[PDB]
Amino acid sequence: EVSQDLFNQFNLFAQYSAAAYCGKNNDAPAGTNITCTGNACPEVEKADATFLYSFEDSGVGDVTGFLALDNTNKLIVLSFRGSRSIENWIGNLNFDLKEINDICSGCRGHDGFTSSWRSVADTLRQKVEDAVREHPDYRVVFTGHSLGGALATVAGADLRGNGYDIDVFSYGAPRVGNRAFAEFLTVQTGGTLYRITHTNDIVPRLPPREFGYSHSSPEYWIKSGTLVPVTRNDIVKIEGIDATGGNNQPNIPDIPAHLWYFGLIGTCL
């Protein structure tokens, strides 16, 4: 159900997302080869991919990630790590909205996601700008898993428009705000958001719609199970804001489903 070219992209960026968690890169010197433990990011190691800027517990909501240079794939990748211990994050998750009129008219988004990014926006926007300068030809891609999918989606919605297309690839990210914010992210030009979901992952079901939240469209749903290899025939595109029968279905959600996106993610062997 999706193309090989999209599958390969989905795969790479899951690993850039898995590398946020899986070591060396929570803070390591610039220009250094990006590497993971326990086979989390072998397509990243295959490339000439190095760090530009590593950050850790930055900003108000403690944002951890790395900005990278990938000369093989010709990318400029800004990756965000989800929470260090996710089970707790989910449970402690507050559903408070807060306005974000600077991103889009009449848009409210998750107050925490929104304030954390808002707090590192200027340093990170800056760092992304110098990379664009140095490599005008390179594709600018934001990505993250979980909470990092949120942050990469909120940073993508906010930085697009300044002359460089921003592609977002988010893995099991939670909803990020209201219908209007959903509509903005569905149609916001200057980049494509690839909201990737997996079977019954619980994170995408949060925060609930009942608290004023909506999802972007479309959705790329992986149907293979936890710990099952993913192929191009296991992903199906699902169209419609708040669409159903992809992750958003009435059955019992699950945590282990959240840690398997193409491979192990959100946790390091």
UniProtKB/Swiss-Prot annotation:
Its EC number is 3.1.1.3. One of its GO terms (molecular function) is triacylglycerol lipase activity. It catalyses: a triacylglycerol + H2O = a diacylglycerol + a fatty acid + H(+). Active at alkaline pHs (up to pH 12 approximately). InterPro entries: AB_hydrolase_fold (IPR029058), AB_hydrolase_lip/est (IPR051299), Fungal_lipase-type (IPR002921), Mono/diacylglycerol_lipase_N (IPR005592). It is an enzyme of class 3 (hydrolase). Active over a broad temperature range. GO terms for biological process: lipid catabolic process. Changing residue 87 to A: 35-70% of wild-type activity. Keywords: Cleavage on pair of basic residues, Disulfide bond, Hydrolase, Lipid degradation, Lipid metabolism, Signal, Zymogen. Used as a detergent lipase. Sold under the name Lipolase by Novozymes. Engineered variants are sold under the names Lipolase Ultra and LipoPrime. The active site is at residues 146, 201, 258. PROSITE patterns: LIPASE_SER. Belongs to the AB hydrolase superfamily. Lipase family. This is Lipase. It comes from Thermomyces lanuginosus. The gene is LIP.
